[PDB]
Amino acid sequence: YYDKHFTEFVPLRTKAKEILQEEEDLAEIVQLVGKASLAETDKITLEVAKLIKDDFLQQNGYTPYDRFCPFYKTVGMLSNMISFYDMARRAVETTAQSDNKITWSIIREHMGEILYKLSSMKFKDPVKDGEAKIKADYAQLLEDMQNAFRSLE
Amino acid sequence: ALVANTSNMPVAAREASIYTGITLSEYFRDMGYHVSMMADSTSRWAEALREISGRLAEMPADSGYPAYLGARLASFYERAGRVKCLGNPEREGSVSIVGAVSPPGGDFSDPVTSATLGIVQVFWGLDKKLAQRKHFPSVNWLISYSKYMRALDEYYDKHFTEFVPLRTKAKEILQEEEDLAEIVQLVGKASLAETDKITLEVAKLIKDDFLQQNGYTPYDRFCPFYKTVGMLSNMISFYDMARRAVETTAQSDNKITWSIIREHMGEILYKLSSMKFKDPVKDGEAKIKADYAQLLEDMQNAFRSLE
Amino acid sequence: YYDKHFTEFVPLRTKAKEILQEEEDLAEIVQLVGKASLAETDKITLEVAKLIKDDFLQQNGYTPYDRFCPFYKTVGMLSNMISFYDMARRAVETTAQSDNKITWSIIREHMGEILYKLSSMKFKDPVKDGEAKIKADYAQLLEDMQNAFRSLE
Amino acid sequence: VCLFLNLANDPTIERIITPRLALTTAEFLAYQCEKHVLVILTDMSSYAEALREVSAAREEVPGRRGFPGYMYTDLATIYERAGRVEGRNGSITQIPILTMPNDDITHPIPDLTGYITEGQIYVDRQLHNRQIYPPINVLPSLSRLMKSAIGEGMTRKDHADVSNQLYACYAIGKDVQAMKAVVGEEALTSDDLLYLEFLQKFEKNFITQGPYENRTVYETLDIGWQLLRIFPKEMLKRIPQSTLSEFYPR
Amino acid sequence: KDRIEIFPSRMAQTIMKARLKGAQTGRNLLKKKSDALTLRFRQILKKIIETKMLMGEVMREAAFSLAEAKFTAGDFSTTVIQNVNKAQVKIRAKKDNVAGVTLPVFEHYHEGTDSYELTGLARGGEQLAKLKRNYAKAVELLVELASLQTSFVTLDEAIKITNRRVNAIEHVIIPRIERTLAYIITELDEREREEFYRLKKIQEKKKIIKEKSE
Amino acid sequence: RGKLIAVIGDEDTVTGFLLGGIGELNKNRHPNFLVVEKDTTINEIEDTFRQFLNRDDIGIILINQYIAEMVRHALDAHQRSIPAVLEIPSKEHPYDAAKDSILRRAKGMF
């Protein structure tokens, strides 16, 4: 079914599960270490995993916007969150061995508006703002991310 | 009157012993007497009760005890209290219960000790570490509590007035002494406020020459209340004077410190420690109060000489 | 029985049990501190206890050489390992707090061929080889060890 | 010695009366014949198993961990038939000996026993594997009546003081040994080395005895002093100066 | 999370008790490691407080001695600064086995290559020679002070790392073992109860069957 | 052989140590020292400080306190042990005591 109607959904589903599992694998040891031995690639995983947990997995069912989440919106906003993961992870993987490593603190300060916009993606009210506006809005966040990365790296 | 039951007595007697005692207690309660009953171990009773439930093949509940354990303990303690007696003589009396608990392992999870603590209004938690240190009575202080403090406020206000703020400050000083323990361990009283040094050293004075009592000495066999409040009043009055002496002079140029206070009026600290030796058998109420009044005056003047 | 026929087994048995128990207590600390601080005697106990665990208490019962180990050989093997222990312990404690302090690193480098021979005792293969020779071979190991420690001190 | 042997393959009900027959004799000998009787009840855990078998024969519903709900009073019935009585010069003491299932002191058998006895001896395993006999661990043991058992007129004046100081010294030696395993020998001071010397010689000379060497109370105390004289007087904080001046030298 | 999630059993109860004893021993052994490091840290920090004070007095004397050399010589500082090639003093790293932890220390090494011998300014060789010695002594003290500080470095991190592990055992790992053990104990009593219930009904049913047969 | 001691300080401070026998040129003709004069700016001190911190043959660095304040941010930024940096009183500047890197690392010290 998913391949017939969406295609993009399945690899997004897989990546989301891997991120959540890695966060749990890290949380077990981070509780004991104190976030001292974490690599920059792990700090990105931990923070994106939080992004997914707080903005994607939870929703307030007694609101005009989270009372119903049409599937196209769920996969739409997941695509952006995973796209951020891949771009943020690439940004550090290609720079960690260079003469300036893009650590979390650099991307966090540079792209703080993207992280807030990504968290706001739930507040789309599909009844007031229909499919056309939501898809266009999500596309705009994707463009904003891609442009910020080009200026960052 | 005494009721004696050893572990090899018939289980009915070991279970019934606790109710036999209180029945004897109520009998005299009805005479207008004040009766004080001690149950040597309510854990031993609970064990006897569980045995009978087992013999009767009753379904066990929490940690193997009968389902009604709590109901039996609750109805036991409810029988204590001050009452207006029956009969035209319009007499009054009371029964107190000071029953002990001794759960296997020393834990507080046993339903018998947990249920007891949810019923009794005062807990005189004792400790073994204090006994090993030869500090008696062995009272834990931080665990112990009393829920009658409000009920007795009318008596204390009517007869003694200053007792209540003194016991409040005393607990605050002792608790702060515990709270400062981590700071002292990591500092050694070097990077420490002079006001905290007062708390630590005065709290020690309280622990040594007030809360500690030596019952094998003829002068300290029994401390009348008026002496207990006298001793605490002077120690707390010293505390307040020392706090003020430092705080009002701690701005700049010429300040008072604990080293100055301790060296300057060492005779006052000695006289405060000596207060427990005022034997009520030989020194009457007026003489002991008079001597305590003199220490209070000498104490305030000792600090006055520093300002 | 043991005192009538062997006279050596009872005291070897006692010492062997002492070594195995001492190793268990030292093992509890090594798992925590990583051998950061050990006495030289403790280092010997750990290594001789491993010698025992691997080359005395371990055997492949489907091999001609260990399908059945006759008692004279079992006690023979232990006799040499315990003799080694006592001589290794004497050497490091006797020269302790002096100039030419002997340590395990010196003993292991000095007489490494002795540890090889001791670890090789399981392979003497009874019945295929003779009883008289196996006893004589173990006597030779004892003479070689005694000369090794004598020349070390 | 009056010896009663109930063998593993003997009737299980006979195992139940065996300790009653031993105490029945002890009561006759002690209280009617004016003498002191030591009663040793070996393997009360095997008794407890025989008691469970009798309970099953009566078709009683098992209680906690399979044992009868009356196991408590049954043990007290046996144990409490001891002590001194007014007006007679006899006495009965007991040393019940109990195997701890799975080495867990929490098990109903040692738990119900200890709850109604006065302290414990406690035989360990570490001391046994280290080839120490007897393998008795002095730190977890307790005798609640020792305070009255010993002292001038009963054993020797210094008994109480030697015991308390030896206990502290052994407890400290174990604590120092734990430290040594972490910081090494070179990180220790002279006082720590004295505690290690005591620890090693305490177990070798005082605790280790052998099955056929009979050490009387006065020899045991003298051995104690031999170990205590390892330390200078100022480190023996639990022995009053009067006791030290009398016994410490020589 | 809250429990180790081992299914209630007598086997699990035994394992948890052994696991708890291990955790408690580790807590105490690491606490002793921390206490030993803390004393030395306070020993080494006390040494730094003492050493720092001495450094002041020693450097003051060297500074005055330099003024004395200048008084005679005049302006030798330019020649000394320009005429530099090889060092006479060098520092070697050494290991100090403070505990299971090893601490890096500096050790003074008098390599020996000759320093510049200068009698060019007023030929004030005696004052310059005393000046060399005064600073040479200062350097050796500073080497010890540098080790002091470096030793204090490897120690502040070692204490925080050890205390963090001890705190986790106390606040995370053992509480979790105790909750697991208490959970197991409760569940085991619950299983015991349902066995009692069934046995009671079995005994009652047997009694009922017997009465019917009579 | 192993490590050199670098000195960043005033004219008399450096001169004294150089006579002390410490200090030399590397194969690149670089000196493990800097003389800080009234005309020396912050970038010059900081660049020298950094190069010593990134130079694997130095280790202990000896500096004047008044300099320690001038580029103080660089002294807390580097937390290691090879680069042990010791702060000393200059000929005229007064004796150091406050703002010691170690007294800051450990806040329990006089």
Short mmCIF file of C-alpha atoms in Angstrom, two decimals, chain B residues 12 43 50 52 58 71 85-86 89 117 124 146 185 211 281:
data_model
loop_
_atom_site.label_atom_id
_atom_site.label_comp_id
_atom_site.label_asym_id
_atom_site.label_seq_id
_atom_site.Cartn_x
_atom_site.Cartn_y
_atom_site.Cartn_z
CA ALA B 12 -3.75 -17.56 72.81
CA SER B 43 5.75 -7.17 67.01
CA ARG B 50 -0.44 -14.50 62.62
CA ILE B 52 -3.53 -18.16 65.22
CA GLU B 58 -7.39 -18.15 57.11
CA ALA B 71 -8.15 -3.22 62.29
CA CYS B 85 -15.40 8.37 83.86
CA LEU B 86 -18.72 6.70 84.57
CA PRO B 89 -18.39 11.03 91.35
CA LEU B 117 3.34 4.38 62.87
CA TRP B 124 10.38 8.27 69.98
CA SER B 146 5.25 14.37 68.12
CA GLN B 185 32.87 18.07 55.37
CA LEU B 211 19.62 16.64 75.10
CA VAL B 281 16.88 17.58 95.62
#
